[PDB]
Amino acid sequence: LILMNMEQIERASDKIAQGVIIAYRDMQLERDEMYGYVNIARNLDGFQQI
Amino acid sequence: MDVLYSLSKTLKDARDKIVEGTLYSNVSDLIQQFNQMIITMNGNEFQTGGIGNLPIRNWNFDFGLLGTTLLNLDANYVETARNTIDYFVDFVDNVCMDEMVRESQRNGIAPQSDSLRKLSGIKFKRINFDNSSEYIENWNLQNRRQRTGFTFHKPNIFPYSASFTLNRSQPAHDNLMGTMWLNAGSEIQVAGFDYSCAINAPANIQQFEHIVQLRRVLTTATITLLPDAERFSFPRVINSADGATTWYFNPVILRPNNVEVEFLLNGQIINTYQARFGTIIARNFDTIRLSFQLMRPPNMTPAVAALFPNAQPFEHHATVGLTLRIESAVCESVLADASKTMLANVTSVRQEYAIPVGPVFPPGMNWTDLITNYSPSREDNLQRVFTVASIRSMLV
Amino acid sequence: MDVLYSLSKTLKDARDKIVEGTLYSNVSDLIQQFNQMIITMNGNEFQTGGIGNLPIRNWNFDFGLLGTTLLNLDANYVETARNTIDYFVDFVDNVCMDEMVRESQRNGIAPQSDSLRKLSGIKFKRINFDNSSEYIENWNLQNRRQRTGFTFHKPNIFPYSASFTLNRSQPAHDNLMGTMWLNAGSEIQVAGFDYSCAINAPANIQQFEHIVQLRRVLTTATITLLPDAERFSFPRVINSADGATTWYFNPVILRPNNVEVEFLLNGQIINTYQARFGTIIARNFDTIRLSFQLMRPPNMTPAVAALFPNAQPFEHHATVGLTLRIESAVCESVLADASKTMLANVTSVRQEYAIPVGPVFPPGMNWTDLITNYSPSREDNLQRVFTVASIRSMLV
Amino acid sequence: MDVLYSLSKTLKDARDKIVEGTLYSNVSDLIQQFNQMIITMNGNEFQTGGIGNLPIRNWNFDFGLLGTTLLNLDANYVETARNTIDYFVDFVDNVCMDEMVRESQRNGIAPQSDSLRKLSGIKFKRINFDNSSEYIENWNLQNRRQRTGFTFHKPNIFPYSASFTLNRSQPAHDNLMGTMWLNAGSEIQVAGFDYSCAINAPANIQQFEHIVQLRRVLTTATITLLPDAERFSFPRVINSADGATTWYFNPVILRPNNVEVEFLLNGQIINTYQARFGTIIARNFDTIRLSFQLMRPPNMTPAVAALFPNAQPFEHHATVGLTLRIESAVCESVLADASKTMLANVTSVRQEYAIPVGPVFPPGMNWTDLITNYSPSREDNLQRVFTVASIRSMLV
Amino acid sequence: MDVLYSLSKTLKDARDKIVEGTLYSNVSDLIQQFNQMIITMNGNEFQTGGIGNLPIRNWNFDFGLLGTTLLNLDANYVETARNTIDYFVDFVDNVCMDEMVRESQRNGIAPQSDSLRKLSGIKFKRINFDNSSEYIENWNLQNRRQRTGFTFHKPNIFPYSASFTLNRSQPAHDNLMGTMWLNAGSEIQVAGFDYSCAINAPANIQQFEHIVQLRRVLTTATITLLPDAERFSFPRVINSADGATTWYFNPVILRPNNVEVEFLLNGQIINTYQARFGTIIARNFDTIRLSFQLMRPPNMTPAVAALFPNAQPFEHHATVGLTLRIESAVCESVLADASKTMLANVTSVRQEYAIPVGPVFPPGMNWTDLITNYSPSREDNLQRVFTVASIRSMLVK
Amino acid sequence: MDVLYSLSKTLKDARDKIVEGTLYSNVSDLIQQFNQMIITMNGNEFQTGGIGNLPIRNWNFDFGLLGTTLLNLDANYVETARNTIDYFVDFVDNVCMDEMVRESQRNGIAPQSDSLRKLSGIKFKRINFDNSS
Numbered sequence A: 001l002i003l004m005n006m007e008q009i010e011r012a013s014d015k016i017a018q019g020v021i022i023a024y025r026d027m028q029l030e031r032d033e034m035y036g037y038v039n040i041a042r043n044l045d046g047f048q049q050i
Numbered sequence B, C, D: 001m002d003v004l005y006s007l008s009k010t011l012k013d014a015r016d017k018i019v020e021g022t023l024y025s026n027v028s029d030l031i032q033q034f035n036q037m038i039i040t041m042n043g044n045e046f047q048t049g050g051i052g053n054l055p056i057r058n059w060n061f062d063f064g065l066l067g068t069t070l071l072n073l074d075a076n077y078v079e080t081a082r083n084t085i086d087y088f089v090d091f092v093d094n095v096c097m098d099e100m101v102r103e104s105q106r107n108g109i110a111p112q113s114d115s116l117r118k119l120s121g122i123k124f125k126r127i128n129f130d131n132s133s134e135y136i137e138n139w140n141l142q143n144r145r146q147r148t149g150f151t152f153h154k155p156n157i158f159p160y161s162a163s164f165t166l167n168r169s170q171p172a173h174d175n176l177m178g179t180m181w182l183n184a185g186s187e188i189q190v191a192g193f194d195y196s197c198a199i200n201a202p203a204n205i206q207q208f209e210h211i212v213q214l215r216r217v218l219t220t221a222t223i224t225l226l227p228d229a230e231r232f233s234f235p236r237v238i239n240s241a242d243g244a245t246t247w248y249f250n251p252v253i254l255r256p257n258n259v260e261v262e263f264l265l266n267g268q269i270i271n272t273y274q275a276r277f278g279t280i281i282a283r284n285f286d287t288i289r290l291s292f293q294l295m296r297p298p299n300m301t302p303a304v305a306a307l308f309p310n311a312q313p314f315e316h317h318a319t320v321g322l323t324l325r326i327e328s329a330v331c332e333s334v335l336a337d338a339s340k341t342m343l344a345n346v347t348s349v350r351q352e353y354a355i356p357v358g359p360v361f362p363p364g365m366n367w368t369d370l371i372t373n374y375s376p377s378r379e380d381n382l383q384r385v386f387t388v389a390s391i392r393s394m395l396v
Numbered sequence E: 001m002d003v004l005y006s007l008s009k010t011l012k013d014a015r016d017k018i019v020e021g022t023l024y025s026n027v028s029d030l031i032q033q034f035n036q037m038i039i040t041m042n043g044n045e046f047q048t049g050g051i052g053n054l055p056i057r058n059w060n061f062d063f064g065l066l067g068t069t070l071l072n073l074d075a076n077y078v079e080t081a082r083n084t085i086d087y088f089v090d091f092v093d094n095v096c097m098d099e100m101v102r103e104s105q106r107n108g109i110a111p112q113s114d115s116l117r118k119l120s121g122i123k124f125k126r127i128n129f130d131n132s133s134e135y136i137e138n139w140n141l142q143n144r145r146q147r148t149g150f151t152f153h154k155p156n157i158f159p160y161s162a163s164f165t166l167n168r169s170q171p172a173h174d175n176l177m178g179t180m181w182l183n184a185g186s187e188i189q190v191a192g193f194d195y196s197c198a199i200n201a202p203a204n205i206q207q208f209e210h211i212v213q214l215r216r217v218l219t220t221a222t223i224t225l226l227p228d229a230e231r232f233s234f235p236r237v238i239n240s241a242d243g244a245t246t247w248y249f250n251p252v253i254l255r256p257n258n259v260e261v262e263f264l265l266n267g268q269i270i271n272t273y274q275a276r277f278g279t280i281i282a283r284n285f286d287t288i289r290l291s292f293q294l295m296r297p298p299n300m301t302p303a304v305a306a307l308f309p310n311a312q313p314f315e316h317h318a319t320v321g322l323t324l325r326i327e328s329a330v331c332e333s334v335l336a337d338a339s340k341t342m343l344a345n346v347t348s349v350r351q352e353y354a355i356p357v358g359p360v361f362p363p364g365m366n367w368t369d370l371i372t373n374y375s376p377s378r379e380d381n382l383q384r385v386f387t388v389a390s391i392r393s394m395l396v397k
Numbered sequence F: 001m002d003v004l005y006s007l008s009k010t011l012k013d014a015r016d017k018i019v020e021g022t023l024y025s026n027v028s029d030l031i032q033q034f035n036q037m038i039i040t041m042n043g044n045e046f047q048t049g050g051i052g053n054l055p056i057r058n059w060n061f062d063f064g065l066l067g068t069t070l071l072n073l074d075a076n077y078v079e080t081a082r083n084t085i086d087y088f089v090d091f092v093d094n095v096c097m098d099e100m101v102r103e104s105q106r107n108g109i110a111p112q113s114d115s116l117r118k119l120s121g122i123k124f125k126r127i128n129f130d131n132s133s
Ligand SMILES: [Cl-]
Pocket: B154, B338, C154, C338, D154, D338
């Protein structure tokens, strides 16, 4: 139970993020109901992961 | 292929085991594997192709996990599981169909559809679990360069061929010596005929030989050997080699003499059976040699002696036949047989969606042409599609 | 039915897995399922009925649970398990026998015996676990109106019929044109005969047609086609249609001409095969149409020309054959086949206990009568009894 | 035998389930069983093969346990497991081969090879786990003397025998009355012939009887019965009983009359079918009694009346036939059949290593000789070797 | 196989690089590999050879490690290393010989000798290091089932066959039309002969065809095609097909006409070369079709016209040749070729110790029989023994 | 050409030497060269083909470095390395094929394909190592 719900519990935390994409192109800030404008990535597709 | 099989097996086990009232301990590992599959597939977009009349289909996966905290499964659990199982089964069936209708010459064993190539990526290796079916087991063993075999009941190893050879003939076709045969599927019927009944033959014996060269090696083969060929035991009107005219065959069946059935591998005799009929075992062979003799009966009752005069006209033609039926065998390669539906499934899927003729298989997946020219590329593509068909059979 | 199957599966798993010295980890889930079955069945009284000569049997369940506190199973554990397993196996066998000998016109799919009706109560659904057999899979699918599938090796789809049709006849029966066939099991042998050898036919062609209507739709069928029919290739004395007289048949086999095998679904040609014999695939069909022509050979050697005069008397009769064998197929309905034993088991149980003939099945469970008039009620009752037979065959 | 089967089953499970990326929950129980096997086998020396050309192989077991700590299996785990599995699979195959090539007249059911004798000790009984295969299941049931069952598709129960009986004959063989039959494998083709066509027979009926005594009792048997025996329906020149001459047989096939097929157990009629053709069920029998009749057609057309004169010479000989195929059956003893490969495996292993003829089996494992004299000692040895062969086929 | 190859490679590197006076920095990694080998082999017992006249050899490994404190290698260090290397090389030679003389019908690619079976354990996998030889590289690719490639100079792809076909003949053998060929090794010499010189032919053209089916597919093949076949260009007395009599062949060579070389794969034309002589490339093929015409020269000088009369007797017979030499090729399977010695080594070892005829290979390692019936099991066994032979050649040779 | 040769030889040495169970000291220098190649190639976009029936192929490099082991390489290391090695081998084969099918009357010795022209830039000279063939 804990193992299968780990990722959901972790992503619910308000004090840690799951990563940061450094893309040296200008990307529009997403429009999110929780923030307004926010530089939030929904996934990491299209980037090398370290 | 292992990931596709694992998806299919997970879905089959979910259908079989996720049933109302069952103890969760009966399905705990299955639910763990199912949730692993969901997690691995979530967030991935798949496309099953538009080859032929097969429609382009897009697949998304954003499913939640199944519960793991009941003592016994209830109706809500089964309905919730079924909702996901239906979508996954549809996706697997479409991926299998897309892979079944494609072929390649350079690399026919590798996946051909984009969905199966995507599933061969490392990120999906987590879905992989028990590979127990015969076809997937053979696939994994062969990827390991390990000796593996498919077991066939009545293997379809002989391309269809009804033909004859006239070792003695004439334009009027009234004094003929030769052989007639049908090699069809797992069956060989051969018959040597002499119109003169070896009246002018050395020792009054006429020798007939029939060699059948199998396109693949067979091992641990159980074979029925019977001393007569009923297919060539009644009057027939038969075209000539060029079709210019038709000749007449009026057999009178005699016991074949000095019957020797040799099963050979690389030209060396592996098994030899002399005057043995019934069940015989050919342990490892690629060629069958049937030698038999028409022996003129030294003593004949008047009714018999009437049939075989000293000279022409010959109205009754002496024939000796053999029948060889391969009941069961083992092959390194894949073959059509009387028990398995792989060839039928592949042909049906190709026919239903009007798949054009490719560069590998003959039109219509015709088995006679396929087995006649069983090239390595054909073997690779055929094993790939047969494995995919077996995977599809688990769900469809 | 699912609860009865689950009882049988649990007992089979207990027989196979509960062995001396085995790790308890090998049986933990099986032991839990077994103890759950014991708890569910404990305190219940069953009666397997006295229909026919089947004896009335009373069943009481007061059994202790199997232990869960060993590292490896020992002889004590195996004996304690085996006593209970023997009693439960006897009970399951008797319940299956009680259900197999029963039928109804209204709800033949529903349980008929009192014991199986009792097992269909909710208080037994806890016993239900893995439904992995083909028959139980199809039972669960059909209970949900889902696409079912049974794979048959040599399906017994054709009711036995050795018949003939004379399209040209007269009291002398010396100039006959027509067809004779044997449709038995998975095999159709047909032969069209012309006594005149199409001397007066237009273009010297005689056309023969044989339509066989299957009582159920077959899918993904692999079929062997052979040019000649050996069953109608020897001289016979055949009774007349009324049985008043006997006529004489003296075939001489010519190869069939313009062979067309059509596999049709609702009168629509799904598959067509022209002049192809070796091995063919019919993906979905319920009717087989075999068209074949006797063509008088334009060029004949003196013997062949002797066979076929310009007018009567006709002593040699030109015959063109055709053999069609369904090696394997898929059907949405249960069928008898050469590999399974369900029909044999049901018939044996009904014969051994002198079960009186019922409203649904023909006397003696005769398969020809059953498949000739395969009604929906007959299908439901047959599926029920065949599923029960498969359940019983897991333990007996 | 149970320990050898458990070794083979554990290795098959390891090969099929220990795959890269698989959840450890999919293998946890299997890993426990595998580690138990390693612990049990470690420190033991085995020797296999000193008979025929089977090489002497020495086996030492010093292997580490598999890990229990991963969440998903990775490459390292699979490589270690694969190395251990390869060694163990080779050992099991060699032990099976060593056991298959040995026989004993006294205790042929007991292990013959020293390796299997060592494995029968208590110190190896821990390896034993799930015994689900039909052959090992029957082995265990036989050890306890419970009722065994082997299901055979086309059981090979009739030793090959093509012979005839002449109830009426004379030196010229022009007026013969008798029967000729082929009892081969799973088929009985029997034809009764009368050269006079029952012209002088009382009521113009000639009675023919054929009794086939099965060497073992068959139960739940599905039988195809067809009116005609095509094998004896064509002109044939047949040796005399002493071989001093040959006689002529020119059959004209009349349908058999008053066909009665009885299936007998201990001389009592268990089943009886009168003029029933197609699929029939024989639930328990050891003898087949086919009684049929040639009835002279009371009404004949001019051609038919021309076939059968009032006295000699008789140029056309009236023949009635019967074909009987056992599609499927159940036997309490092991038998060769079309679908399995046990006989083929044992014969191939004995032929490959040139095993000298022993005191139990016929040379070459001739099945006709084996089933002709199916003694209890032969039955014990054959069940032993067939079970070992089924164990070996799980891996090899 | 990889462990045996790694043993041989380590030993060869030690023999080549552990030399007096060399910097320790030249051999540090090699010394570590050698000591790893010593540690892995120490305390293990091996037995090699109980087949034919090959003696039973028992091998024990109890060796000290080579030192690592030197900055340059001195004589004593090299001598001790040489003693250890000599023992190890003897062991590796014997293991290779034991493996080369064995064959299996089932798993011919798997180890057959018990020493190599023991070396196939996990504990010995530590010995594995650089696998750079062509044969071991192909072995590792084949284990993973990647596209293998063996480069052969003059591949021995054609089994020996000197035969002829008569399309026109009669018992006097004075008016013959046909072809005679020798397919031997990497060479095909074919020659079509017409005794009448196509006097009565349809437009004075006689077409000849020769089909050669390769038992394995060849890729990237350099092939020399020469117009004439010197092998069938001199007077010959040739047995009849039945051997009942002998006939006479007095050829006069005319240049072949409309020469067409067709290189086909699975009965599909891959390469076609028309009237092209010299070096040609066949990129991927398994069948060669050589079609060539004898064209009667319309204009003849008096001597040429005297050679070919209008009718019989025909004293001079018109012949057109073709020579095809595969200089180099690539095959996914092992083959005998001119440059390598793998087949020679395997046959030499098998003959040296009187290895009895096995169930796989022909009765004596005859290459014509092997390539004639080059079955998958034979291919596996041949690849195994050839890889072992190449491993042995690194040390014994 | 020297850079393309160095890529090919680095890949050949990686295939031959990065084998399960080998001492990390047997590959240390090779691993350093391979990681230098990965660093230099990562983030670069290459295109091959577009001539005849040679397909247009796009190559992107976003690989991580090969790690280290204390004593001996294991199976996990070999598979992880082999994924990258396979991609690089495919890229090198495609670049070689693109270069083999092109020719120039002027400067026939100079690179003709765009991929090889890019590989002749200064940034890739880092990859260059032993030119021994
Ligand atoms: Cl069958």
